[PDB]
Amino acid sequence: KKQVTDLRSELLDSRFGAKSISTIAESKRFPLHEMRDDVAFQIINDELYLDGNARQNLATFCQTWDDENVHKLMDLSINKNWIDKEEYPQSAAIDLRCVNMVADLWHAPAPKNGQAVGTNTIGSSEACMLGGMAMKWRWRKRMEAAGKPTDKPNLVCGPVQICWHKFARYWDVELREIPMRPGQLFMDPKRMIEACDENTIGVVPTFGVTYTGNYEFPQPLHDALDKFQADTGIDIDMHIDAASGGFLAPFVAPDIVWDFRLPRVKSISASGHKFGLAPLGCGWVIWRDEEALPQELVFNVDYLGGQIGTFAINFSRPAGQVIAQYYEFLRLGREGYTKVQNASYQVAAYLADEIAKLGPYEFICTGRPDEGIPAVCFKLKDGEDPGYTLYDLSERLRLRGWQVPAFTLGGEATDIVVMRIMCRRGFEMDFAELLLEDYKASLKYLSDHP
Amino acid sequence: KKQVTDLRSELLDSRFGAKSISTIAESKRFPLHEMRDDVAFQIINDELYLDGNARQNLATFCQTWDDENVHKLMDLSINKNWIDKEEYPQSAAIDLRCVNMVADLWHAPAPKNGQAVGTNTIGSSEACMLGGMAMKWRWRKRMEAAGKPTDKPNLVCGPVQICWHKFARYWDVELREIPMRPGQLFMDPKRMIEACDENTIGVVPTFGVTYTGNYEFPQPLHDALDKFQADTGIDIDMHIDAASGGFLAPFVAPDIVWDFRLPRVKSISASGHKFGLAPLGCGWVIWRDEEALPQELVFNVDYLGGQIGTFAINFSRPAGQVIAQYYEFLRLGREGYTKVQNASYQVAAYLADEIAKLGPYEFICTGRPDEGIPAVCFKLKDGEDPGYTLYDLSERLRLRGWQVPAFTLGGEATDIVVMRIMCRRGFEMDFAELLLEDYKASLKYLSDHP
Amino acid sequence: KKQVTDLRSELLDSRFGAKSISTIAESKRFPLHEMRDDVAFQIINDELYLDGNARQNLATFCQTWDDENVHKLMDLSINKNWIDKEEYPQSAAIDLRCVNMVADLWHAPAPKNGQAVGTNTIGSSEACMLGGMAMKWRWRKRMEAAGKPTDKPNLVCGPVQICWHKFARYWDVELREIPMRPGQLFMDPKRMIEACDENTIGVVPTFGVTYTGNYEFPQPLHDALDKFQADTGIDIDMHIDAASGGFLAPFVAPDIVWDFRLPRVKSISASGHKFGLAPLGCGWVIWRDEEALPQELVFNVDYLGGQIGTFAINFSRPAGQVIAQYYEFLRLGREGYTKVQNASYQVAAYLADEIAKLGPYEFICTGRPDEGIPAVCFKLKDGEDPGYTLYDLSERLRLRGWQVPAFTLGGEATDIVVMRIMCRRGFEMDFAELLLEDYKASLKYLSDHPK
Amino acid sequence: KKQVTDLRSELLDSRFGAKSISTIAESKRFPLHEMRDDVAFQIINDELYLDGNARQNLATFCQTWDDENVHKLMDLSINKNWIDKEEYPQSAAIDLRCVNMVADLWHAPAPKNGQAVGTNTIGSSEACMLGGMAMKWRWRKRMEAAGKPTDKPNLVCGPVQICWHKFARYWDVELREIPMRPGQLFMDPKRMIEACDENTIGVVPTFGVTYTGNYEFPQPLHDALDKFQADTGIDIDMHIDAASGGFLAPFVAPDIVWDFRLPRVKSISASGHKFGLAPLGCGWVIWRDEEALPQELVFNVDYLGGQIGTFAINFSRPAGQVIAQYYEFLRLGREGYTKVQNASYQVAAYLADEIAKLGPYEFICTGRPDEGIPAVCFKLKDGEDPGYTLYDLSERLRLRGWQVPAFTLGGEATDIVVMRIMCRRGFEMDFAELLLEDYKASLKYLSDHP
Ligand SMILES: *Cc1c(COP(=O)(O)O)cnc(C)c1O
Ligand SMILES: *Cc1c(COP(=O)(O)O)cnc(C)c1O
Ligand SMILES: *Cc1c(COP(=O)(O)O)cnc(C)c1O
Ligand SMILES: *Cc1c(COP(=O)(O)O)cnc(C)c1O
Ligand SMILES: [Br-]
Ligand SMILES: [Br-]
Ligand SMILES: [Br-]
Ligand SMILES: [Br-]
Ligand SMILES: [Br-]
Ligand SMILES: [Br-]
Ligand SMILES: [Br-]
Ligand SMILES: [Br-]
Ligand SMILES: [Br-]
Ligand SMILES: [Br-]
Ligand SMILES: [Br-]
Ligand SMILES: [Br-]
Ligand SMILES: [Br-]
Ligand SMILES: [Br-]
Ligand SMILES: [Br-]
Ligand SMILES: [Br-]
């Protein structure tokens, strides 16, 4: 009989009075029975509060805010499968438009074909691996032609992001990473060349180093490679990892030569969901021409009576991000992006200037558009001790919900501890002022409590 | 004067009356100026109508519908980055619960420290490549131990999905694919063994073949491999590609032994956004134990005063799907999933029965839960000419917005043309009846027009 | 133990997991029990996907898009009964303001009572029948005065829309329809006169012919009728069927004299839900003065102390459309409408120009504001053969969701097959370009597959 | 120089601080310029408040409330054109399902080919005119056959609704309306017959008289017509005007024989937007068989290879209501409707009982389901005077927003003043109690102020 009583409650009982919400959520085995949808939702929604406030997350590089239209486009495309080119043809079409534009944006040679050579991706990581395989294949072919061994390929680069380490491991490539050293936290021409040989599949400059936020200018490295060929006959290509810079420089530092204007640059990759203003789940990779992308890596698909080529490690995935990306392009344009990016740099500059007045800080990065991304990276002046450590400050800030990372650099600077503040879209001046206030407040506390 | 008149219009002009919407959308170069967001949105929204109705797309296997709560959870997590374990800790937590849960659904051995060994992925593709590298590495190690060459690895499998071909290409592995042949459109024990040798990294059965919708039972293949070892001493492992079956059999055919109940199965993968009921952008891969996943492939990350391992090709990406998947698990449970899956099978069976009464057909798949996924896959009886070809029929149906594919099988059955109807969640009986009606209607037309 | 088991499911089951959605929808008898509202809704919502995409329906003349405000106004007025003038007084009031504004747009003589004479309708059809009865009654009275028989009334017109045929049938009037003939797909002065007599209740020019999209200019027909009276003493009135043109010309071709500027025009009708930008369910009909509308057809109703006359076939009905129409008027005004209408003509012109370069077509309408509505109408150049009929092409386009009709004209042109593309609000340039693309694509396929 | 200001203002000004809202709305000529959409909306929205509260409108018979789903279905179908059968096929399909269902509800002979004869309409009015022409045509044909004059047709009826008067006028038919008289406010058998002749096209009983809310039982009238034919050989048909009753009796008084169970009833009409629970803009008319509907009144249109007849005065119009009506049918069914209608009757009965205790009243309708619609209709007992008139009361109640009509009956009862309260869906008991309270309060005031 109670089954009826209990059943009436499953019905009328409120949400927090419901019996279904009186136990802890399952975490070990697949649940047995179904439950009130509202309770299940409520439970998960509430658990998520423990993630903290994304808008206050100053560690991430990825977008933490989206405009109303992107939200709608995403919900509208929650089921559009980016991979089924023939089934969702217009989405496929839009994707191609974006490839042209990004390629265009990066000064790629006008596609005489009428359609730039590139592809969308879940993020820069996939993009990089695509670019990676591209290089390994191009290299492999070249060596086989000159009848040389192709079993000891290596990749030369500076302080790259973890995904390159992953590439090297998964595709068995020796990663020759020029280490960071006091005074030079990046790959310089000299040390680069000293690492190149006939087995080098390419060099990967990082146009926007994660750890520091500074650009790794390709120009000088490009020259060095030109000379290197003149001296050894070894022709080395470049792949720019512009996850960050890719959607920054083009708008606020158009004179920095880092893209396809450089001959050795055969491919560029960037994260659309970082400064590209697209929602998480979007990356881009562009090749300078059909000759830069080995046909053996491309798998053709049926697209509108013809055949379009694909090259992606993933398969089925939402098309929402690409659609949104295209939206931001049409809605903002160069003008728009510039204004938005400036806003970020403006804030980064401000914080850098202000924070400098509150302690013995040596700034590694101060949001100068001609030097890198809208970031503020710094460490304690060597030797000097203010009473705290950057780790300490960080913690204090976390008490107000802020996530401002404090970490050690790598290579030959493992004893240098820096703090890095990222100024993404949606971290307006007024909001950043609050950060500053809590920063001053934190110092005061650390002072009164040695 | 003019600029002000123009501007006042840019301000009061209605959406369609405005000047910004009087030109074709940009598709070749990055836009120069910003424009009214409502126009930009409208343009894109409308272009998307050319994608067709996803609910009527009977070709895809991925979810084309999501409940109200998933929509909310997705919008709420539009900016949660699944990769930043330390920054969005609870999302990370929830993900782990999921793995546990999936591993449980597949009989994985009682996990160690309360946490099964697995990872979430963008889709089955990434999952499979993860499982792939796992095998190659396990094999490589083994061979090096016995001091044998590891430069000629091959993978044995039946009619796999394109991602495996991609795996083989990207990771340089010989793909030995047992071809489909009339009467046997899958990998049989005999032909499998004839393809295995000491260089075989593993066998990949496809628990839910795409082309036909039928299961490729691992049991028989497993026995064959047991014997094979007894005769050659060669121990071969399996990796089940359960993109489809993975979230079907467990609920409607629990007695089919295909998972971890089989000793040789070291890893299983499945598409969460297919029959897992998760929105696009979610896949799963589980390993039998810590010994099946080579530590060299794992990159530890900081997480809750300790180190957690991560294995993925991607990096930054939305955590929405994993959060949603967890939701569907708690809200539905075995009971729920069963009910939902049954609904699908019920429809597939209905269509298969009805369609049979309208033409000279030989069914390859008829929505039998004990044979495979909820799909209807048939062909014209060898030697019959009803007046039309399945291609013709597909096109007549598209006239009503339906997408019912007609294609040729591969291997030794390249001259066999089949039609395949997928019955996903959200293709209820009443809705399928309408397909049937249009089906009958199409036949009538094709009849009246020889 | 089973009813509770099954009940708990009714409660907890998923939408599609639910048992209620495991059967086909009822279609023969009134359902017996109630069911989960969400399921019932889901079922219907999904069936509707089979209607196709309205935005891609290039056959219809009626609005296929509405702004956010109209949507709200409609939702807000889902229960306001347009007929209960005394119960929903302000709606009634707003309605009247519209009649005044339409009458003003059409130059109707300025009313001295302050309120023009006209009424709102569900659509042009009802409007036309109201205008029809008006004429029959005016005629009937006139004849009875001159002591003549009133049992053989006829109506003269060109290629009218089906509703007129319906009028003729329902109200027993002989319909003398001047047939379309190659080179002249409309009613010309000469053939018109040859059909008029003392039994003719009136002539109905169609200011925006459906089949071709061209205007049927009243000016010349008006003159002809003036002469006709001078020679026979027979005074014939006109009723313009401006379902389309009514809300087009006034903004993009103000010089075309077709409205009340013409003396014989006693009444005009137009579809508000067509180019009037109102949501489906709105039409208008205006009379030039209180003398053009026979009081015997009017039913006065109590309205705020005084009296107000009601002339309409339908009784109860949504006031939403009227309210929305008024909104569009205030929000857009002449300026607004003009910009919107231009956008349409602009697209129609573009398509017409581009499609012409793809084959041996002879155009019947190129979207010129001075000739007709925003539409592109055409046929295959007489005696030509590119390897396909316009019907085939139509089909090829349906495969992309487009609905572009291909049909045969009537009268003496029954062997001429045309295709007609309608460019309504919400068929922006970028969107139309996609149509063009698919059009080129269709031709290519038809080419590679002669069979 | 001032313009640029007016513009900047028209851009930032709030809705009410804007200049566009400082003038009275245009009401004489078509506006010249466009204006801020928000202002235009606001203006109209606010004017509409002067309409009063529809939920409190107890004079109307039409729905004044709709469930959330109907609202969505209506918004979803704001652009579906009910007339374009070929262009919006499924809506057309749904429509037909309703026709069968209503026919089934009224006991029409089970259709011959799975489809009953009838059509949807904007409201009962159009439905009645369709039924009217039907009769005139049937009659006309009959007479022509027997070679008799067809220029003096008349229609016999009781206290019909205004639309019939309109029918008579527009289609030139003599309306013989048996007048209401004290003690008999409806058409009785005897006076009906005394009005019938060979020129009578039919008799129209009103199954739910507006003025009083009581049913006009067809049974007795039907018998009288049977006899009439036996004595004169004149066969007269009936057309029931069940605008109200049509969707009431079937559920709460199934034993009242008034529909197609009666042989002479060749057509029935009813307002779906009244007690059919459909939103305004929906009516129905059903014919007993293909022989009752003159093919000359039908016009055919191409629909799915075939064709279907369309009898309808209107043309283009929304399909939302029909779609909603179908929804209410499936969601409620007999069970549902019965529960909803009972709720209304229950309220009507309650008010009738309570109001009777407040003054010297004589009731004409007390919400009995076996006598008529859920309404309360009373007058002051003859020659009795409480100190007011039903007009005063009506007015006093209006002061609280209530619209409770007080009017005089017609015919030979023009000196009888009645008050009529309509109890539609959405006038629940608790709500009605408030009316009662204000009713008592009104009486008290009228008492203290002679
Ligand atoms: C952030 C970043 C990546 C990773 O890109 P995702 O979008 O996370 O896939 C790779 N390289 C660099 C230099 C980065 O900053
Ligand atoms: C659909 C499918 C895949 C690809 O799944 P994704 O989610 O797109 O990665 C892989 N394998 C099989 C057997 C499949 O059916
Ligand atoms: C569309 C049209 C009609 C029909 O009027 P509705 O508003 O659709 O009821 C009548 N006449 C003409 C000339 C039309 O174009
Ligand atoms: C309300 C009513 C009508 C009017 O029909 P509408 O649905 O209002 O168009 C006609 N007859 C009767 C008996 C009515 O009650
Ligand atoms: Br609560
Ligand atoms: Br609650
Ligand atoms: Br956001
Ligand atoms: Br340093
Ligand atoms: Br507009
Ligand atoms: Br707008
Ligand atoms: Br959805
Ligand atoms: Br076969
Ligand atoms: Br579900
Ligand atoms: Br649900
Ligand atoms: Br819309
Ligand atoms: Br012609
Ligand atoms: Br304000
Ligand atoms: Br405001
Ligand atoms: Br409501
Ligand atoms: Br009485």
Ligand whose nearest atom lies closest to the CA of B42: 10
Candidates B32, B52, B335; nearest CB to A33: B335
Q: Does the beta carbon of A41 lie under 8 angstroms from any beta carbon of chain B?
A: yes
Nearest to C282 by CA among C297, C269, C298: C269
| Pair type for strands C117-121 and C283-287 | antiparallel
Which segments within C145-248 are labelled E, that is strand? Answer: 154-157, 174-177, 200-204, 238-241
Name the amino acid, one letter, at B251. Answer: F
Nearest to B51 by CA among A322, A123, C45: A322
Between CA D101 and CA D108 the distance in angstroms is 10
Atom 5 (ligand 1) nearest CA: A124
Between CA A275 and CA A253 the distance in angstroms is 14
Ligand whose nearest atom lies closest to the CA of B413: 12
The angle that helices D89-105 and D320-356 make with each other, rounded to 10 degrees, is 40
Between CA D163 and CA D170 the distance in angstroms is 10
Distance from CA of C220 to the nearest CA of D (A): 28
* Ligand-binding site membership of C210 (annotated): yes
CATH architecture of structural domain D358-450:
Alpha-Beta Complex (3.90)
Distance from CA of A8 to the nearest CA of C (A): 9
DSSP element (H, E) containing D382: none
Task: Count Cα neighbours of A220 within 13 Å in the Cβ-side half-sphere.
Answer: 12
The residue with tokens 């005031």 is D445
Q: Does the beta carbon of D231 lie under 8 angstroms from any beta carbon of chain C?
A: no
Q: Which residues 6+ apart lie within 8 Å of C178 measured at CB? A: C156, C157, C158, C187, C188, C191, C192, C195
Altogether, the residues listed in chain B come to a count of: 450
Q: Which residues 6+ apart lie within 8 Å of D385 measured at CB? A: none
| Residue B3, number of CB atoms within 10 A of its CB | 8
- Tokens for D130, please give them: 């369709």
Q: Taking chain D, what is the end-to-end CA distance rounded to the nearest angstrom?
A: 67
| Pair type for strands A306-310 and A361-366 | unpaired
Between CA D42 and CA B125 the distance in angstroms is 53
Contact A59, A375 (CB under 8 A): no
Q: Which residues 6+ apart lie within 8 Å of B186 measured at CB? A: B158, B159, B180, B206, B209, B212, B214, B216
Name the amino acid, one letter, at C305. Answer: G
Contact D286, D108 (CB under 8 A): yes
| Residue C246, number of CB atoms within 10 A of its CB | 30
Q: A and D: touch, per 3+ CB pairs < 8 A?
A: no
For this entry, resolution in Å reads: 3.2
Looking at beta carbons, which residues of chain A come within 8 Å of C12?
A: 10, 34-36
Nearest to D342 by CA among D365, D369, D375: D369
- Tell me how far the alpha carbon of residue A426 lies from the centroid of ligand 7, in angstroms: 9
Name the amino acid, one letter, at B334. Answer: R
Residue C240 pairs in a beta bridge with C268
Looking at beta carbons, which residues of chain B come within 8 Å of C52?
A: 401
Between CA B450 and CA D244 the distance in angstroms is 53
Candidates C1, C14, C445; nearest CB to A305: C445
Between CA B196 and CA B180 the distance in angstroms is 18
Our CA dihedral for D428, D429, D433, D439, rounded to 10 degrees, sits at 70
Q: Does the beta carbon of A75 lie under 8 angstroms from any beta carbon of chain B?
A: yes
Looking at the domain covering A64-357, what would its CATH class be?
Answer: alpha beta
Residue C158 pairs in a beta bridge with none
C358-451 placed in CATH 3.20.20.70: no
- Tell me how far the alpha carbon of residue D172 lies from the centroid of ligand 1, in angstroms: 82
Our CA dihedral for A108, A109, A113, A115, rounded to 10 degrees, sits at 20
Query: Which residues of B are annotated binding-site positions for substrate?
Result: 60, 81
Q: Three-state DSSP class for D420? A: strand
Interchain CB distance below 8 Å, B339 and C429: no
The angle that helices C320-356 and C89-105 make with each other, rounded to 10 degrees, is 40
Protein fold of C1-63 = MYOD Basic-Helix-Loop-Helix Domain, subunit B (4.10.280)
Looking at beta carbons, which residues of chain B come within 8 Å of D35?
A: 12
CA-based torsion, D47, D53, D57, D62: positive or negative:
positive
Give yes or no for residue B210 CB within 6 A of ligand 2. yes
Nearest to D132 by CA among D96, D169, D159, D180: D169
Query: Which residues of D are annotated binding-site positions for pyridoxal 5'-phosphate?
Result: 124-125, 210, 273
The angle that helices B320-356 and B68-76 make with each other, rounded to 10 degrees, is 150
Nearest ligand 3 atom to the CA of C126 is 9
| Residue C191, number of CB atoms within 10 A of its CB | 16
Distance from CA of B105 to the nearest CA of C (A): 20
Between CA D336 and CA D14 the distance in angstroms is 47
Burial of A248 (0-12, 13-18, 19+ CB in 10 A): buried
Q: Which among D331, D339, D403 is the top mutation candidate for probing chain C, defined by the most C β-carbons within 10 Å of its own β-carbon?
A: D331
Q: Which among D3, D6, D36, D88 is the top mutation candidate for probing chain B, defined by the most B β-carbons within 10 Å of its own β-carbon?
A: D3
Nearest to D199 by CA among D238, D145, D236: D236
- Tokens for B75, please give them: 């919008």
Looking at beta carbons, which residues of chain C come within 8 Å of A4?
A: 4
Ligand whose nearest atom lies closest to the CA of D78: 15
| Residue B61, number of CB atoms within 10 A of its CB | 22
- Tokens for C423, please give them: 């460019």
Q: Which residues 6+ apart lie within 8 Å of C240 measured at CB? A: C204, C205, C207, C218, C246, C258, C259, C265, C267, C268, C269
Distance from CA of B393 to the nearest CA of C (A): 13
Query: Which residues of D are annotated binding-site positions for substrate?
Result: 60, 81
Looking at beta carbons, which residues of chain C come within 8 Å of A3?
A: 1, 4, 8
Burial of B49 (0-12, 13-18, 19+ CB in 10 A): middle
Contact B154, B142 (CB under 8 A): no
Map out the domains of chain C as residue ranges.
Answer: 1-63, 64-357, 358-451
The residue with tokens 């592109």 is C376
Any idea what DSSP says for residue A289? S
Between CA A228 and CA A236 the distance in angstroms is 9
Q: Which residues 6+ apart lie within 8 Å of A299 measured at CB? A: A309, A310, A311, B162, B165, B166
Atom 8 (ligand 1) nearest CA: B316
DSSP letters along A248-275, please? THHHH-TTS--STTSTTEEEEEEETTTT
- Tokens for A106, please give them: 């990066």
Q: Which residues 6+ apart lie within 8 Å of D74 measured at CB? A: C74, C75, C78, D66, D279, D320, D321, D324
Contact A223, A262 (CB under 8 A): no
Give partners of A (≥3 CB pairs < 8 A): B, C
Q: Does the beta carbon of D3 lie under 8 angstroms from any beta carbon of chain B?
A: yes
Nearest ligand 2 atom to the CA of A81 is 8
B212-to-B176, B185, B356, B358, B380 alpha-carbon distances in Å: 20, 8, 17, 21, 15
A375-to-A58, A348, A423 alpha-carbon distances in Å: 10, 6, 6
Nearest to C232 by CA among C244, C222, C221, C224: C224
Nearest to B334 by CA among B244, B250, B425: B250
Interchain CB distance below 8 Å, A79 and B90: no
| Residue D269, number of CB atoms within 10 A of its CB | 29
The residues in A 190-209 lying below 8 A from B, measured between CB atoms, are none
Between CA C187 and CA C173 the distance in angstroms is 19
For a ligand 4 pocket test, name from C82, C310, C316 the mutation site with the most ligand atoms within 8 angstroms of its C-beta: C316
Q: Which residues 6+ apart lie within 8 Å of D261 measured at CB? A: D107
Residue C206 pairs in a beta bridge with C241
Nearest to C106 by CA among C227, C320, C329, C259: C259
Q: Does the beta carbon of B145 lie under 8 angstroms from any beta carbon of chain C?
A: no
Candidates B47, B346, B433; nearest CB to C22: B346
The phi, psi pair for B140, rounded to 5°, reads -50, -50
Nearest ligand 2 atom to the CA of B163 is 10
| Chain B to chain D Cβ contacts (< 8 Å) | 22
Nearest to A348 by CA among A425, A277, A403: A425
Q: Taking chain C, what is the end-to-end CA distance rounded to the nearest angstrom?
A: 65
Task: Count Cα neighbours of A365 within 13 Å in the Cβ-side half-sphere.
Answer: 30
Q: What region does A351 belong to: left with phi over 0, alpha with psi -120 to 50, or beta?
A: alpha
Q: Which residues 6+ apart lie within 8 Å of A38 measured at CB? A: A15
Burial of C344 (0-12, 13-18, 19+ CB in 10 A): buried
Between CA C410 and CA D35 the distance in angstroms is 44
DSSP letters along B143-207, please? HHHTT---S--EEEESS--HHHHHHHHHTT-EEEEPPPBTTB-S--HHHHHTT--TTEEEEE-BS
- Vertex B212: Cα angle to B206 and B218 (nearest 5): 25
| Pair type for strands C154-157 and C174-177 | parallel
Q: Does the beta carbon of A97 lie under 8 angstroms from any beta carbon of chain C?
A: no
Alpha helices in B381-420 (DSSP H): 390-398
Q: Does the beta carbon of A169 lie under 8 angstroms from any beta carbon of chain B?
A: yes
Contact B379, B362 (CB under 8 A): yes
Distance from CA of C46 to the nearest CA of B (A): 7
